[PDB]
Design a protein around this ligand. Structure first.
Ligand SMILES: Nc1ncnc2c1ncn2[C@@H]1O[C@H](COP(=O)(O)OP(=O)(O)NP(=O)(O)O)[C@@H](O)[C@H]1O
Ligand SMILES: [Cl-]
Ligand SMILES: [Cl-]
Ligand SMILES: [Cl-]
Ligand SMILES: [Mg+2]
Length: 329
């Protein structure tokens, strides 16, 4: 079986009540202490509003969880409480519920987000280095708490470009890492699913989040988001294989003793690894550097054991000056 290279035993050492979200008894707050002000988003499982504290009027975010199973409600709540206060994690402020319908609501800090479709074309070489570093600080922290995010994507990375604050949000797909556990591969979003999700490798770890970050980083520096534009889960692996090459995919399949479907094998075919320099053009050359390619190259690997950890990534030469500006304080 496969185990994480780092933070392998966190949930083994911690007391059971840290990761046993099934047995969590929520201590709810007064639900009438908040009221919606304007609907701000939606989803398959919730409907998030810009709320407002009834007293302070101070704004917030009210994520009203739809009829989901109580086991998944407790999981997201327990993860948000374990990660509260960590660097660049969205701050859970309160947890309330109706008392009549038992419908729960998660109260978050408000973030003056700029949607990635609007913000990303205006990001510079320095902006990308800074924001990816802030996102790496969030991933390293949650990995150090024995938790995988499993839904890293631009829609879940809130950026207030005026204050240059970043917040990793949406933890409804997050899970505790237990060594040797077989997880559901129906996680994350199509364009950011790691190869392990597309080949049914169920004993994945924190490195799944590093692949998703790699897809984001590729789409940013090449100004081609989504970078792997697959039309379904099978075509997603095909889009990956024509970039990374099939010969390293075959080695990946042989190592973990996996096998592709007869149908999927016909679509993947045989392909040479494409050099990252082939994706440079006049519109994105100002964002692409040799350090950027080396850092990207060490994230997008079939074998999840060869991907950089978050801490290994923060130490890459691509982030040298960002660390210089950070240590100066
Ligand atoms: N703290 C926040 N501040 C501002 N907007 C927020 C905040 N949290 C969430 N949102 C908005 O709400 C949207 C969806 O919230 P989210 O927590 O991802 O619910 P969701 O149902 O899990 N979405 P999904 O990825 O489809 O499952 C985001 O894309 C933002 O536009
Ligand atoms: Cl799940
Ligand atoms: Cl290259
Ligand atoms: Cl990590
Ligand atoms: Mg989301």
């Amino acid at each position: 079986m496969s185990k994480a290279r780092v933070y392998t035993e966190v949930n083994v050492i911690r007391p059971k009540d840290y990761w046993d979200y099934e047995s969590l008894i929520v201590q709810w707050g007064e639900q009438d202490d908040y009221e919606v002000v304007r609907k701000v988003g939606r989803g398959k499982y919730s409907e998030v509003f810009e709320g407002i504290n009834v007293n302070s009027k101070e704004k917030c975010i009210i994520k009203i969880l739809k009829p989901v199973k109580k086991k998944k409600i407790r999981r997201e709540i327990k993860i948000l409480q374990n990660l509260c206060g960590g660097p660049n994690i969205v701050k859970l402020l309160d947890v309330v519920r109706d008392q009549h319908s038992k419908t729960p609501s998660l109260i978050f800090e408000y973030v003056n987000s700029t949607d990635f479709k609007v913000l990303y074309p205006t990001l510079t070489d320095y902006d990308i280095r800074y924001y990816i570093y802030e996102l790496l600080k969030a991933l390293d922290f949650c990995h150090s708490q024995g938790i995988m995010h499993r839904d890293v994507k631009p829609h879940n990375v809130m950026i207030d470009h005026e204050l240059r604050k970043l917040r990793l949000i949406d933890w409804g797909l997050a899970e505790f890492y237990h060594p040797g556990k077989e997880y559901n591969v129906r996680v994350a979003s199509r364009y950011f699913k790691g190869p392990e999700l597309l080949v049914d490798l169920q004993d994945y770890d924190y490195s799944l989040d590093m692949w998703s970050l790699g897809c984001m980083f590729a789409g940013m520096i090449f100004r081609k988001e989504p970078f792997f534009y697959g039309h379904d889960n099978q075509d997603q692996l095909v889009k990956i294989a024509k970039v990374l090459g099939t010969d390293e995919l075959n080695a990946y399949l042989n190592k973990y003793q996996l096998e592709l479907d007869p149908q999927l094998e016909a679509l993947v075919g045989r392909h040479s690894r494409k050099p990252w320099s082939k994706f440079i053009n006049a519109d994105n050359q100002h964002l692409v550097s040799p350090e950027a390619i080396d850092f990207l190259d060490k994230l997008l690997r079939y074998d999840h054991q060869d991907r950089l950890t978050a801490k290994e990534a923060m130490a890459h030469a691509y982030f040298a000056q960002v660390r210089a500006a950070e240590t100066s304080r």
